[PDB]
Amino acid sequence: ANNLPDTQSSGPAHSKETPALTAVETGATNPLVPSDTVQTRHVIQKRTRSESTVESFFARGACVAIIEVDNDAPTKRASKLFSIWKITYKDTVQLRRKLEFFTYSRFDMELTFVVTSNYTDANNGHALNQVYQIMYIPPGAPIPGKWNDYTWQTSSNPSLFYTYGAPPARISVPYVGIANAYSHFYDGFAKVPLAGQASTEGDSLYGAASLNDFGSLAVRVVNDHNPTKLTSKIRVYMKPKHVRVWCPRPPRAVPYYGPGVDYKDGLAPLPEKGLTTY
Amino acid sequence: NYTTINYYRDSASNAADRVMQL
Numbered sequence: 001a002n003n004l005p006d007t008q009s010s011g012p013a014h015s016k017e018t019p020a021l022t023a024v025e026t027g028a029t030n031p032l033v034p035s036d037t038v039q040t041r042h043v044i045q046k047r048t049r050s051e052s053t054v055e056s057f058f059a060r061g062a063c064v065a066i067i068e069v070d071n072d073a074p075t076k077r078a079s080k081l082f083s084i085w086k087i088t089y090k091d092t093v094q095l096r097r098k099l100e101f102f103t104y105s106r107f108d109m110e111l112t113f114v115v116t117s118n119y120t121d122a123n124n125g126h127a128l129n130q131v132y133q134i135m136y137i138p139p140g141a142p143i144p145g146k147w148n149d150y151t152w153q154t155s156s157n158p159s160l161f162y163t164y165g166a167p168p169a170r171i172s173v174p175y176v177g178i179a180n181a182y183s184h185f186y187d188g189f190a191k192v193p194l195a196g197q198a199s200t201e202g203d204s205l206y207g208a209a210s211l212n213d214f215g216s217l218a219v220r221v222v223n224d225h226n227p228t229k230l231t232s233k234i235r236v237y238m239k240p241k242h243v244r245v246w247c248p249r250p251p252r253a254v255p256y257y258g259p260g261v262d263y264k265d266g267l268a269p270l271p272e273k274g275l276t277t278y
Numbered sequence: 279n280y281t282t283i284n285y286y287r288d289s290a291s292n293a294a295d296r297v298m299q300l
């Protein structure tokens with residue numbers, strides 16, 4: 001984040017000290033500077049690594065979900081009057097890759113909700129401004145089965161009531177991990193199968209645990225239905241704040257295939273170029 | 279001892295290891 005070191009002038013050298021020659025077998029990166037191999041002038045460095053900080057790298061709102069809801073009528077079976085979305089950053093790739101640069105992370109989160117609505121037909125009248133309810137459902141809490149069941153009382157569940165046309169809604173969340181850091185990767189299982197029990201029992205998905213269980217968001221339109229159908233989409237933008245990260249990893253090189261590290265397609269990411277072609 | 283005296287102007291007339299980086 002802070003200023004880089006200056007460059008010191010270097011003249012000709014004739015000595016038994018050989019910074020150029022090293023041994024990478026040790027696993028240590030040679031900390032050479034230009035003045036070690038070539039003659040250098042004095043440069044008072046003014047560049048800084050301020051935008052390379054882990055905070056800056058993640059200080060952007062990244063779309064992570066597009067939740068679709070409808071306001072048509074209870075009778076219509078093809079219209080989804082409410083939508084439940086499991087909270088995760090793995091429905092999108094860009095933030096997922098930036099995060100999976102690191103094994104562990106710990107950060108507060110900022111959720112911004114951009115709601116856009118539209119008509120689906122013209123010859124059924126018009127609609128009044130809609131209010132959307134976004135109810136956070138932590139794991140274990142009752143999940144709505146209908147758009148107007150008791151669960152939406154939100155006596156305890158945090159809930160956001162957004163008026164259409166208002167600026168995108170926004171909330172902040174502290175670090176809510178049950179562990180001391182978020183696990184981008186979990187090399188293990190939630191169950192250990194025990195000798196004796198049937199192959200059906202004890203079988204758990206690889207890499208899946210309750211560390212990444214954060215509940216879901218239930219989104220509905222609070223208004224009663226107008227004689228015409230209205231389709232709305234809530235876009236969720238996640239911004240990490242106060243980011244700490246641990247154990248850097250090589251970034252994803254091939255397309256993601258599911259919530260894990262599985263790959264199936266695009267296994268040839270590199271193009272063809274001659275060895276002696278510039 | 280011996281004595282020497284010059285009798286002329288012009289003095290011509292007087293009597294007679296392995297690792298290295300460059």
Ligand SMILES: CCCCCCCCCCCCC/C=C/[C@H](O)[C@H](N)CO
Pocket residue numbers: 087088089099105109111134135136158159160171173176182212214217238
């Ligand atoms: C006010 C009601 C709706 C809005 C409130 C929803 C709160 C949900 C926040 C806690 C769950 C998400 C916490 C962070 C998500 C992932 O773990 C991180 N991307 C991990 O890297």
